[PDB]
Amino acid sequence: PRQVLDLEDLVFTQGSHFMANKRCQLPDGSFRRQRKGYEEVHVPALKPKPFGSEEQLLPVEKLPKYAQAGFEGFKTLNRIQSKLYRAALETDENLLLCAPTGAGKTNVALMCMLREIGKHINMDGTINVDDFKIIYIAPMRSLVQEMVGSFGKRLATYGITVAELTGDHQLCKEEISATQIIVCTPEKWDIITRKGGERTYTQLVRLIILDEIHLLHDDRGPVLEALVARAIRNIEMTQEDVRLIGLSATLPNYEDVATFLRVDPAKGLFYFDNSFRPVPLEQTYVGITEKKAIKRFQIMNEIVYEKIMEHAGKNQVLVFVHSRKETGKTARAIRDMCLEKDTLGLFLREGSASTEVLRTEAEQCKNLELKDLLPYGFAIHHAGMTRVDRTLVEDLFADKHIQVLVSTATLAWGVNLPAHTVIIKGTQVYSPEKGRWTELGALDILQMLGRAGRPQYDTKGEGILITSHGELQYYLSLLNQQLPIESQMVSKLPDMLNAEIVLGNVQNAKDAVNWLGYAYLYIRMLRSPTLYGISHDDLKGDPLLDQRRLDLVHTAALMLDKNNLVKYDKKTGNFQVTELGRIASHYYITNDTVQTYNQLLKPTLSEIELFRVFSLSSEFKNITVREEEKLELQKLLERVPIPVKESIEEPSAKINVLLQAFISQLKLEGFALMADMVYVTQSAGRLMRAIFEIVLNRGWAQLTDKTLNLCKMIDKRMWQSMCPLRQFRKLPEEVVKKIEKKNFPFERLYDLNHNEIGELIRMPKMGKTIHKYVHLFPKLELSVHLQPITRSTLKVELTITPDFQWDEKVHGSSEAFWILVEDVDSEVILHHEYFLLKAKYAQDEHLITFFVPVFEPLPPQYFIRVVSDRWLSCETQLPVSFRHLILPEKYPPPTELLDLQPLPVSALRNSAFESLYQDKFPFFNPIQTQVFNTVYNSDDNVFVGAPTGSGKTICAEFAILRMLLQSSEGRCVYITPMEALAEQVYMDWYEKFQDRLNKKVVLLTGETSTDLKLLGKGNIIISTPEKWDILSRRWKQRKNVQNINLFVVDEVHLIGGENGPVLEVICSRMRYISSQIERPIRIVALSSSLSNAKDVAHWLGCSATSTFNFHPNVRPVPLELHIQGFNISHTQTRLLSMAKPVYHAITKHSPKKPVIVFVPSRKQTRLTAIDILTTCAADIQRQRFLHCTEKDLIPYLEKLSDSTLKETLLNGVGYLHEGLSPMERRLVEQLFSSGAIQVVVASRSLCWGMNVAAHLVIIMDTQYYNGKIHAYVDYPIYDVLQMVGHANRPLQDDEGRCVIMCQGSKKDFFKKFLYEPLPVESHLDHCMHDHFNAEIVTKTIENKQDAVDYLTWTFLYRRMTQNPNYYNLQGISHRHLSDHLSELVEQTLSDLEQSKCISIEDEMDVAPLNLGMIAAYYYINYTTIELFSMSLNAKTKVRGLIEIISNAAEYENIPIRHHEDNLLRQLAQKVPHKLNNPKFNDPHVKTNLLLQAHLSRMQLSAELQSDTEEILSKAIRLIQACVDVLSSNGWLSPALAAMELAQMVTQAMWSKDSYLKQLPHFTSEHIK
Amino acid sequence: FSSKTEWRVRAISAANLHLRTNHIYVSSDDIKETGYTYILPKNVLKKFICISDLRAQIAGYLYGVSPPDNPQVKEIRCIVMVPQWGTHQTVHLPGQLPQHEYLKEMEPLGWIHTQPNESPQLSPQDVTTHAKIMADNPSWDGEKTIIITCSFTPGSCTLTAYKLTPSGYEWGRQNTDKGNNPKGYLPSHYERVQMLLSDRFLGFFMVPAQSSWNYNFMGVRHDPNMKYELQLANPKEFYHEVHRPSHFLNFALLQEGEVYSADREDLYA
Amino acid sequence: LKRQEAIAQNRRLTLEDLEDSWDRGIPRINTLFQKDRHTLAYDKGWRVRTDFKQYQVLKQNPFWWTHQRHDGKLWNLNNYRTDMIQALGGVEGILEHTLFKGTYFPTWEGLF
Amino acid sequence: TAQCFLRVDDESMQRFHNRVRQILMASGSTTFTKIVNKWNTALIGLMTYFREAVV
Structure with missing residues (x-):
């Protein structure tokens, strides 16, 4: 069915600039005239709409009382704010406010914020701050930095923390966890949702506010469409409602942004045209007509002079230019023209307060460019001048002293200083991402022209927009509600599809089509098919447009699997995420860029080739090297320190030397070259981090050292041979260059005193500060305790000791490190892991236990490099030396399953003995057939090492039947290391040996007074090691401890765990007693399959013929063990990122068969039992886990206490933990054993105590928080082996599957110890x-x-x-x-x-x-x-x-x-x-x-x-x-x-x- | 040197020195059959070829032991890079021999050094260097210490180990003419000894602890009587960042820069 | 290796980079600078045809195992003539046997 | 590890002696230079194929 589309045909190549309209119809009094080389188009000030007869500006004393504290200084509201105070405070509808720019849209966002703030009022206090979060998504970053100040002032009386999402991903998840109003760009919030750092707080996000949603038309459009499709899709799947408030400019297709935001067009959609603009602007458009660009530049300067002189003494003028140099250039140009035509005194008449404040503020000024202009009316304001001097310009313009401010665009975002006249000079910005001079965006023009007319003084704004004449109709359509908002998603559709594949939001092409239906592209393709490459023939043949979404998904997925981002089969349509996919989604790099990094990254890349692989990114595909800067590039290429293999007229050499000229802090001169440098470095942060993650994941140690160093060199803007004291920006640079001049190693500075430092630098004044900053520098002291587990695996316990004084102003909430364990050549990382050194836990040792592989050419060392993720030259290397390392012997091979013909029960002797095995099974499993003749028909000590689920307790029962054959008053003693296992085998053997053989089975409890009686009266003495330890400690006194005839020890492989030395001591004592009491105590040790089972055999007296150590592949039901790595170092984030793969593992591995999901804690099981249900109800298969009817559940549901257990059990997913009663536990186990429910989410500590076994066992997150050491300790492998052995249904199942979701740091630790048998080591x-x-x-x-x-x-x-x-x-x-x-x-x-x-x-x-x-x-x-x-x-x-x-x-x-x-x-x-x-x-x-x-x-x-x-x-x-x-x-x-x-x-x-x-x-x- | 862009093309050339490491040749001729045999492991040879320069000679002191019950063969187990600088024809190693507690279990087996191109004879500078190291350090036995020369042939590396004869140690001890043809220099001053390679075991490296090993750019900071501790680490490349600090550190600071820069918001960061 | 360094530097190989390995190698480096690269690059299976030329032409075929356009010239025979002229006593030593002084030519180089 | 020893087989020497006998079938009216050119052709065709094994 699928047909591959031409995906670059369907895009709009102009980007933010595409006009969907052919016609632009103007207001009434809106003449145009061809003056001289330019056509001037006036559009008059629209009269405001006359008030509705029952509509008035309500005061703040009529909105509710919780919201009155936000509107300080406001007596009344705006007209637009009065039209929808009832829809922003009384109703939880999604809104789409389409107001003009400057018409008070941020107070509407404040009203929605006050509604969500006013749901947490906490009657005696003020605000319950931690039950909600509000995202404010604003397009530009300086708009975000001033919205932080505005919402921090307005919500100060609520104690609401407003902050801006910046920094690395750990800083961003800490800022999300700390704050309530999270103000961010769409790209920053999208990169957080892709990397997952908000996943723990998306049930807390109840309101996202999309400021300037007409950014859907921009080339930044796909980011907003991905964000809103993701949030709306989570509303339709997870069913927790978030409120979406889109603030827009008044532009067409606003009803499609309304349908895009799930805004009901009755209650939520508010479209205020440009008459509702507060200060109505007379807008002039100068479109320069002639075709020689130097005459166009001279005409533009003549027009800014003429329009300045039109408002000379009358009004302030705010000229907006493109560059920072152009700011002073055209300020001095119109000043030179005013001085030339002798019209300079028209601005400053002798208004001696004004010109005297200007003169004395000029002579105080440090900016020599601003001091040139401020004695007259003129001034400049770019982002490059001083904070003091640019707020001097702001305050001198707000006091009507500066007559002509000239500025870049950033003022229009950063400051709400409006002027009477604004004059946008030029509309041409050099965009380096297109690599050319492109037109100003819709966003920047609408924001620059929102500053026309100040709401205090002005009755009428005046916005002149000097353009080329061919670009005149675009801005006429933009500023007069006629430029339609069209989706740009076909540009970035494979990248957003990859972000949905990586997050698991889409899995097959049907879910990707479902996600594409939530995009703005789908609604625009439905409403305007012709503009998006769809004929009306195709809309009549596909009215919901599903085949076009399949074609778009298939084309984007072909772009994804061609670039190896997604494993996409055209057979089923399923997507599998690749780790290149995760890296490209996490760091926003395009699919062509990861295909470049897949082709070009080799393990053998130098630092020379690494800049070249970076420079061939597809983010820089439009960077061309122009000849007008080539000379300057040569002056960089002879000074950059990493050599460039290319010639300088190739663009990759330009990107190479621009990155190296950034890190070197070389002063550049061309405006195009500085702009290209700023672009390639702001891309180079994410691009080098993506190279680092690709290289780290493939394990290349030299290239991951180079790439992590280059990430930190791009970030810190210094080369790594420079002093590490440049990363503390508070030092004087002269003393830092004195340190680099006196080039000793930086580690020499640690051993010195504050006198000794200061006289080594010859700076005795600076010495104490240098000492403070050298001891603030992050420095971990590592110690290694290595223990050979097998011949192949070592256990490295690395203790990390912080040897630096923590300080919150330099380190923050956390310091992130990488622990890289690599071979002798340092070219393969054997084990990398992330290490968060949190600020609560500085100055104390961190135990990081991991397992590294050791190969047959035994290396002399491994190296543990603990490097900083952020700090340059913060690296501690520790050589784990293998000189005196005695590896264990390569263990003997396991005993094979000899293919015995399967043992009928008549091979047992006595009729009463078969009468308890007749109806259970006709033949024993092959382990019992091989083990039978030694356990039943012999009298040796027997070791049976078989996997959990092989039925070794029936080998114990063989030993017991032998002991009851020898004399009927014999005495087995059965030791299980877990008390719940003792309870389970007591329930088994009381029905087996007491009911049918009338032999007394007792189970020992922790009382020594009654255990002697139970041991004297019982023939089968069940116990725990600590209950048998207190009896056997006095075995000389107790005769009943001595003359036991058989000592079965189930699961001696728990000798290598906690409460394991006591098991070792009681078996060693039971062997030592047997060496002394005239009659041997026959030990039968059952265990999981061991590697070192010759040692357990030699320790328990087993022969080489009586030691049945089998393999983990020997099981009667074959185990299919899949292990899923989750490379998420934060553990609640990993634990929530596992919730949808739990359901996907259920659907892939066992759709109609029982499932146990083992979770780390008592509180995680209820959350996961609900997350399985919200994901199965996200799909249409609700109640798919209830294989019976609700007719049958009411006698079992009316017994329970936990009501949410009834909520989850009625939908078919039970759960189990310690806090449930054995009432509820046994009834959930009975509902699960019968097959009535399908999923049981059990805690980690219930792995031993479950009288139930499933088809699929999912083990979610094999770690748990030990709060005594404040660390997530891994599961002991005996717990994981029992959990795996719960995937064992003998007769009902052909296989048994187990999906272990674990952190990828722990992945190879499980790929070792679960397929190959278990090495147990005594901890006595x-x-x-x-x-x-x-x-x-x-x-x-x-x-x-x-x-x-x-x-x-x-x-x-x-x-x-x-x-x-x-x-x-x-x-x-x-x-x-x-x-x-x-x-x-x-x-x-x-x-x-x-x-x-x-x-x-x-x-x-x-x-x-x-x-x-x-x-x-x-x-x-x-x-x-x-x-x-x-x-x-x-x-x-x-x-x-x-x-x-x-x-x-x-x-x-x-x-x-x-x-x-x-x-x-x-x-x-x-x-x-x-x-x-x-x-x-x-x-x-x-x-x-x-x-x-x-x-x-x-x-x-x-x-x-x-x-x-x-x-x-x-x-x-x-x-x-x-x-x-x-x-x-x-x-x-x-x-x-x-x-x-x-x-x-x-x-x-x-x-x-x-x-x-x-x-x-x-x-x-x-x-x- | 040309010192402005000679190191740039040299640096680029040295970035491809890992292609020389699968084409390794061992000169198996003129080997006297009655001496020791030397097993250089291919991992430290690969690392030593990669960290080298095609033109300037680097050198590392070899340390090794003999295998159990085979004293006539010498497994090189360590290459100690020390602070050196080297011309195209000699290496200026410091006077202090490598001292560390990991090199106490091993004996000094001589030194390895790279050559820019293959010569059929041992250099006179190499036999004077070896004999001065022998005359100043009594732990260097002239029977067991060698000079491996890793000559950079086209697209490959040719390795030849040489031993000093007792004529050669006496001549190189008395020699002061540091030229390429000194007086009294005969090809009886050396004998080619058997040296062979190994996948079967791995060697390691010792770098200096306080500084790094390459002083070819920091040439004034290198004294022959300098003192250094060692460090069980892997050595950096020849043209690594920390080895040429005047290429990364002599930059004028950004003084009134970024004032006429570009306004571009880092939206993602 | 020189071709790999030439592609990355946007450089075409000339006679300056290959004058040190002239007439060295099987096949010869001279075949790289022939005018018929696109013509001789389409001739596959020439050696077995060159061996089977003996069943088509009546003359005997020395050098059946090689072809000069593909493998180049595998020998040099000008040094033989040079050492032959040098070893026979020189041109004036040879021309005593040749009745040249009866012909009244003062030099040898102007003759044919 | 080993040594390879090369020799020219008997069939090539008999074929070369056949070529020598074919050169010796020249007539008395045939000039000496044609016979010497045939001899040089046969000697080059022998030596340039059997380069190392003739010695």
């Missing part, structure tokens, strides 16, 4: 002191020699010889191993004797003291009782005792998440004891507040009582430890205080309250 050497104390009180460790002899039983000893450098070893020899173990034991026993937990006699023999017996009895960390016996005195009390118990190190693993601080501060003002120095980053004061809130039985948030139940589980053993330490210390009263604390923490009451709050349902009415 950091968590050692507990188990050493426990084996000392058992008298297992009686001397330090037996401490080493006990340590030989661990996994730590087995892994110190296979991966030594993980454990700070230097060899596997007996000397290295023995002395490292001896240093380990003599460090931990020094820590235990210094804690007074043990006692060391003869420096060799250890013995348990009192504190060690207390610490190993009730399972407390040794440092907690080190704190207890040091921190309990004889006079402590329950007021301080909760501070003692809350300071226990059993509470350091309480979670601090984000948004946890201030409601804890709200908890710090209520609870019955205050906290001296409470820092709400502390876990301990959080547990103090939560203990007090449990004792005061206060209401809590659900996520905080989720942690209070975590606290109170360990509280009671801590209080018993307090009881026992004060028992041994001999203090009656603190011991009785602790015994009181034990009973009140169980009954949740206070001591200073009476003793009946204990009873249920008794509140303070009963006390009173």
Whole structure:
């Protein structure tokens, strides 16, 4: 169907200047005359419309009271403002105000701002500033910088922060997060929406105000059409309404801008013609007729002289010229002509106040050009003169002293100084983007001619517009409502389509056609087909114009896949975003420019070739080198420091030497050459950043050093060999050139004193300032801790230490760095990542953990360069040296699935044993067939390393059936590392082994008194490692710990995580017991598939024939694991940018099959369960995730407490987190297991506890905010492996898919550790002191020699010889191993004797003291009782005792998440004891507040009582430890205080309250 | 030199020195079979060719070890770039030999230097340089230390390692004539030794710590008795920004510039 | 390499850049400066035709393996004549055998 | 790594001796310069193909 269009045929080549009208019909008294070489066309001052008989200027005392504070100084309103105060304050309609320029359109924008400000009034206060944001999109940047001042003055009484979007993308997202009125250009807001830095605050954007929307006609038109199509499309998809207020000039096709803005033409459309202009302007048009341009220039100077002399003494004149030099040139030219014809005194008559203020203001002036003119009436105002001098011109013109101001266009945007007469001299500006002298825009002319007539003094404006005669009809159509607003989007349609492809707003060509229907191009193509290349034959054959939008989308997509921006198949029409697409969208570079950077960027490019690759950009395709500047270019080419391979009459050499002449700060002289230089450098910022991102993404380290340096050299405007103290602009340049003259390295300045610096520069006056600025310069000190994970992968833990004083005026809210880890050649980046050093977290170390690959020619080093993203010569290189790096051995290959014929259940022996496997499955899976004869039909220790979902718990059950064959009063002990896994296997085996085999299955809980009974009475003893640790610590006493017949350890691959040393200690103890008790304890270790499974086999006594270590590809349902990198370093931005790819992964990978979406937090699951639904309701497939009917959901929906869970479940997406009840959790799991719903959005901590498995598992954002260190720590790979193993439906599914959306920094870390088996390493050497104390009180460790002899039983000893450098070893020899173990034991026993937990006699023999017996009895960390016996005195009390118990190190693993601080501060003002120095980053004061809130039985948030139940589980053993330490210390009263604390923490009451709050349902009415 | 635009065409030429690094030739003739063998790894050879100049000679001190149970072969494991400047026929290295704790595990195996074009003989300036370094540093054993010359042939590089004979060390120690043909200079003053390349292992580089290695533009800042620490880094190119600071630093400052510039708003930034 | 440097500098190669490698290479550099570039560039498969010329022309064909317009001249035989004149005692040494002094010509260079 | 040794085969030498015998079939009325030119043609056609292997 698709037909490729000629996309440059359909554009309007004039751009902002295209006239859609053929005729221009003028007002009535509007003569024209051919005078002499010019035709003068007058158009008279339109009489204002006579007032409607029931229409009046309402005062500000009639608009509502919240809006009265904005209109200060205003008694009444304007007429245009009075016509639509009811549509801007009382109605939430989208507006399109088409008023004349200068007719008070910004107060209309203020009215809409006051409506959106007046929805957050906060009755006792003034404004709830953080529930809303208002975007004010104004076309020019100086208009933005003065709208910031205007809205900052008017909204000052509301406390509303108005600011301008400028700076880098981090500065822009910080300015969006800090402010309410965000005033920006269309391009800046569009580049923020493309890069994504507003995505967290687009639900907060409730009002965008498009100032000067007749920029739709400009060549900047596609930016506004993309912005409004994106906002209107998000209104139609996301269904959160934003209010669009388009302010326009009165031009035709205003009803098409109304349809474009979704403005209803009854309520929202307001078209005020030029009669409603406040000071009605008589407009004169001088169109110069003759055809020799020097005579045209002389006639133009004669006309500005004649029209100046027409308003000589009567009125002020504001002449508007194109250049800054032309300003003084024609000011002095009309002054020389007035002095020539002796008419100079007509401006300044002897009005001696006026001319004396002018004379004494001239002699004060520093501008020698302005001092030439100010004694007479004349003055100049460009942006190049001083702020003092140009505001002197502004204030001298506002006081009617300057008779003739001459100015550039910027005054017309920057200042609201209007004059009586304005005279636009020339209408010809040199635009370098076209590379030629083009006409003035519609925007600049309408703004320059809005300054005609001041609203205070003038009854009539006068605007003379001196033009060429062929260009006369354009401005007559422009200023008299006859220049139609036509879309320029076909110019930039592939770039806007690429921006919608990159953002994921369009996916296939149908969604791209849908987006193109929201553009202004579609409405203009519907209303005017002929102008846009459509015949009426084609509109009659396609009335909604869908085939033309398909043709435009297909043509733009052919431009996109030809330039490799989009993978576009013509088969299905689908788009795939390329990383060149992301870079071109993020940095606005055109599709031809990224095709140039795809062809031309090689890894081997020098700095010479990099300027050449930059200079061949398609942004500079119109830059030609003219001969009139070639001489000057040669004077640059002999002075620029990077050589140019081209000849200077080729344009690329011109762009090259103009960029280098910018960075060198060479003074240029040609106006065309300075304009081309300003253009190529304002493009060079984004172009060099796009080259840097292309080169960084492909991994080229030398070119990414060159390109990042060149970004910072273009930005800072200095070469990198210059002093870094030029980036502090507050220094004198003479002392900086004295530093560069005395060329030592800049790092020499760090070691010196402020005297020593000042005498090294010979500037002892400047020395203290140089010292302050050298210590303000960003400087990170890096330290590396590298640990070999496998032979291929290292884990580098890079600690970054800020060694510079932070200062907000130079650094800002954040300093951005790049961490580049590269090989010995520094030509491949092995790992780059962005690093935000935030201003809260200076002066403290940042742990950045990542994984780098190591290849078979083992390199001598890697290099970690942490460079600044913004600062030149801010780079710290650190050589990660691999000299003494002992890589682990290349691990043995996994045991293969021998293709056994699948095992029937009759291969099991006993009939009762098959009677619990008959109806489940007829044949076992091939893992169980291979593992069966060793587990069931043998008696060896068996390691089964199989992926999660292979059914290794049935191998545990094989071992249990063997143990129940040997004698029926046997005893399995089943250890699972997670308590929810223990609950799940208890629910499985109580139905399996107790109901059908009548063997007692017990599950151990945290009470030692009842666990001995449960172990004595049970045949299958389910446990967690910490519940079996407290039993097995006294295994000499407990006979029931000794004569167990089988010890199954599920998931020993969790030995390399947190709560993993305890699992290692209990399996090492269960092997050590088995070495001593006349009868071996048969260990069956189940695990995920390990790489180093020979070490777990050798540690648990498994054979080489009984070690079934399989591969991750061996699974019964094959896993298809896709990993999606999201290169968004900000994590809420990444987490919101993942929300639509979650739904797209659901639609691509499992449309009609179950989905689990694992999310980082308790609060992210509700948001993602709603974002899946808003995206499926954005499409027409609403309720596509509900595979049952709502007939069937009401018995399951009426049970729940969370109402939004019912809102999401009725549309088919449930969600799960910790804060739900197991009521709601089990019922959502039952709705999901039955297939009634399709998506369940589960939290990250529910990966272990889910009795459900899906077809697709999406893992959104594998990081989570550890608020104790204020960093986003990555998921441990055991959590990700369990999440992946939830994509396992054995019978229902042929495959199991898992889409891991992760940050691209973490992408290769998952491409390693999920397909290849798992390397587990013991972390016992950091968590050692507990188990050493426990084996000392058992008298297992009686001397330090037996401490080493006990340590030989661990996994730590087995892994110190296979991966030594993980454990700070230097060899596997007996000397290295023995002395490292001896240093380990003599460090931990020094820590235990210094804690007074043990006692060391003869420096060799250890013995348990009192504190060690207390610490190993009730399972407390040794440092907690080190704190207890040091921190309990004889006079402590329950007021301080909760501070003692809350300071226990059993509470350091309480979670601090984000948004946890201030409601804890709200908890710090209520609870019955205050906290001296409470820092709400502390876990301990959080547990103090939560203990007090449990004792005061206060209401809590659900996520905080989720942690209070975590606290109170360990509280009671801590209080018993307090009881026992004060028992041994001999203090009656603190011991009785602790015994009181034990009973009140169980009954949740206070001591200073009476003793009946204990009873249920008794509140303070009963006390009173 | 011409010093105004000679370095511009030289800089451009040196920007393409990575094309010389896949066309490498080793002169496998005149090799006496009874000495050591030298394995120069191709990564530091590639990096050393890229950071060089086609005309001015750069030089790096070679450091290396011998492999386990093969003492007759010498794996060069390090090229130490030091502060040097070089003409087209010699390299003026400083008097201080490279001292660092990473070069204590290795022994000095001599030096590598680039040549502008291939000569069939060792330069007399090279044997005087090698013998002065040997006479001033007793850690330079004349049996094991070599001079690799990477001569820039057309579109390629020809590498030839030479050793000093005991005649050559005595002559080059006593020599003062710094010309291209000094008296008493014979081709018995050197012997070509076997040198070969390697993908199997990787070398590294040592650059100076405070400054960088190329003093050909900073020629007055280079003293023969200068002192330098080292740094486990990769060396910059010959025409890198930090090596020619007078090309980037002698600019007049922007004094009353940008006052008659162009008004163009950076809309995106 | 010189062609790659010549394209980027907008330079056409002349005899100044190729006078140092004259008559060196297979094929010869002389074929680059022939008038028939566009004509001889369209002649593909000339060597097997040159070998099969022996089945069409009755004369024997030395140099069947080469052609002068494509590969150039692969030898130089003027040094042989120069060393032949030099080694035979010079022209005055040769002309004693040749009955020249009976012919009353004072020089040799003006004769034919 | 290795050495390649070149020789001229017997068939080329027999073909050259055939060419010598064809030159020796010149008549008595044939001038000497034609015989010498045929000999020089055969010698160039031998040597310029068998350049290194004749030695």
